[PDB]
């Protein structure tokens, strides 16, 4: 009945219509906004939080139906900073006690890669850079699954992994003419912003593909590097499950070790343990021990002069 | 527009790295002031209160012995002397670098 | 039975009532280890070197002690801040000392598939890699919040007593293992 609630529910419905979501999504998201509004802390929240809340309710709905809407997309539409969105999203998930499924990688691959403008020639997209949409999506998905199996996805932003995988899929589909094109040049012609971590994901994915190539006798003999491995990506993905298992020691049946990159960073110091002390909080406190924390009359005068 | 836009934090606010002698000067401030970070942030014209507090908390970790020594080694607090010495240290060392 | 891994306490948050009203302007001006900007924050920020901690001293006489690595260290540090305040001329007492929060950490020394854990234990797990790399596990028995990372490193928080950190870690270890 509240004027700010009616305005909020109208904004929830308008966001769903702008996002072209299925008809069932609007009702679920409206229900979450109504539920949110039953808490006094949400009812008395700033109009800016009530604007972000519109987005949180629509994002939660999309996540539960594996609709690949990112927090970045919502922040753009709501003119909200991500940390502003993070505090409202984390609060409302705790407050409504909600189970929020993860971003669906397979669905994000389809939506994000379809935005890559490489399926028709143009002044900025030459003929040799044009690729089949289905061939591109299928190979990118296989490379995203590989990155996921070889611990490159866990704890990282999923989008830069898809950017690196889409680029590698595109290069591997015509290696002779596309190996000269860098990740930055590729995102520029496809008209997609380059996420900064995508270059790191690329290098990690190329390192994984190189370890795999060592498991095929006819590829091991070619002494491949991060450039020459690209034309064999098709061959490597054809036997990805098998090659991953063979290339890495760590894995159950129910020198290379399959581990997350943050475990192989190899710093010269790992968790400098706090020193074991069992000192009782009942020990005597001397006057000299305390007096060192007090200013002298001269120190007081010198501070007062400086203020 | 897009529904797959990359999600990154934007409220990041940049601080310059501490010069080896700009650090020497930071430890001079713990000797003159103590641990009042706002007052030390006034002794540094291009360093905010937070910048002093984060520097203190970094030095606290990596070089604990230096934080403890600068506090135990009490020194007369001369605002003017610090200002002139800091302006010269940030100039001379930048020149020699 | 047990994992053989003992979480290390990284931080203790304790409170104490000095049982008297305090003039923070006086404390700030006359202590060496005090910071006070009432326009920014209403309390005095005080630090001692041993145990290495930070205290928030309020004009109400209430105090918050942070940073200690043991409950005994937090009590000894809290008593030292109380003694600093007493020497500054205030009739400070040491009333209702209480440990409010404890943070522990450890390493299970094996990688963790967070995306898998958020599926088998969805009702306790919140994994948002668009915001943070760690899975937020809200354990109900004991009521502890764990931050679980792909590296196997675990942060445990929200404990009132040491045993709650150990109990939560012993509970999570088989869940993380298999």
Residue numbers in the entry:
A (entry chain A): 65 to 318, 354 to 406
B (entry chain C): 286 to 382
C (entry chain B): 157 to 334
Provide the publication's sentences verbatim.
RNA polymerase III (Pol III) is the eukaryotic multisubunit DNA-dependent enzyme dedicated to the transcription of short untranslated RNAs involved in essential cellular processes, such as the entire pool of transfer RNAs, the 5S ribosomal RNA, and the spliceosomal U6 small nuclear RNA (snRNA). Transcription initiation requires the action of the TFIIIB complex, which is both required and sufficient to recruit Pol III to the promoter and to faithfully initiate transcription in yeast. In the context of such TFIIIB complexes, TBP recognizes specifically the TATA box inducing a sharp bend of the DNA, whereas the TFIIB-related factors Brf1 and Brf2, similarly to their Pol II paralog TFIIB, recognize TATA-flanking regions and interact directly with Pol III, thus effectively bridging the polymerase to its target promoters. Bdp1 contains a highly conserved SANT domain, which constitutes the major module interacting with Brf1–TBP and Brf2–TBP complexes.
